[PDB]
């Protein structure tokens, strides 16, 4: 685990990831990232980007990390990993309760990948994602 992790995402999808007045990233998605990368014990610079360019630049390695409501899709897993689930793909439908987005990291990264399943882990059982959940929401948007 190297002291840099550079997290590219889609500042266009608030209350996810947006950007405000002062330039700062906000949003759930952000929330997740900084609260997981505080307990890997990692430093976290947020990389702004088109959405068709993240997979591309993780590839590139010009980020290392992708967190912008990733949805974790067949044709994703081909090219890269994936963390265990964030939250659920699409809110707007139980039927998309199950599905789900997700940290996009490269398949080599099998320690990285890691590393930030073990925080999701440990900031869901101590109750931070509810808590940082009933910020954004008043529905389960974990989902299943």
Same mark, same amino acid.
């Given at each position: 685990?190297?002291?840099?992790?550079?997290?590219?995402?889609?500042?266009?999808?608030?209350?996810?990831?947006?950007?405000?007045?002062?330039?700062?990233?906000?949003?759930?998605?952000?929330?997740?990232?900084?609260?997981?990368?505080?307990?890997?014990?990692?430093?976290?610079?947020?990389?702004?980007?088109?959405?068709? /360019?993240?997979?591309?630049?993780?590839?590139?390695?010009?980020?290392?990390?992708?967190?912008?409501?990733?949805?974790?899709?067949?044709?994703?897993?081909?090219?890269?990993?994936?963390?265990?689930?964030?939250?659920?793909?699409?809110?707007?439908?139980?039927?998309?309760?199950? =599905?789900?987005?997700?940290?996009?990291?490269?398949?080599?990264?099998?320690?990285?990948?890691?590393?930030? =399943?073990? /925080?999701?882990?440990?900031?869901?059982?101590?109750?931070?994602?509810?808590?940082? /959940?009933?910020?954004?929401?008043?529905?389960?948007?974990?989902?299943?």
């Amino acid at each position: 685990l190297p002291q840099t992790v550079r997290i590219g995402t889609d500042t266009t999808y608030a209350p996810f990831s947006s950007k405000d007045a002062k330039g700062e990233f906000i949003g759930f998605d952000i929330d997740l990232g900084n609260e997981m990368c505080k307990r890997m014990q990692v430093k976290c610079t947020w990389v702004a980007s088109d959405f068709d /360019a993240l997979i591309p630049s993780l590839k590139a390695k010009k980020i290392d990390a992708i967190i912008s409501s990733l949805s974790i899709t067949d044709k994703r897993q081909q090219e890269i990993a994936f963390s265990d689930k964030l939250y659920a793909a699409d809110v707007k439908d139980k039927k998309y309760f199950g =599905d789900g987005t997700g940290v996009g990291l490269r398949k080599d990264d099998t320690e990285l990948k890691a590393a930030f =399943d073990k /925080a999701l882990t440990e900031l869901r059982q101590d109750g931070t994602y509810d808590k940082m /959940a009933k910020k954004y929401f008043d529905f389960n948007v974990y989902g299943d």
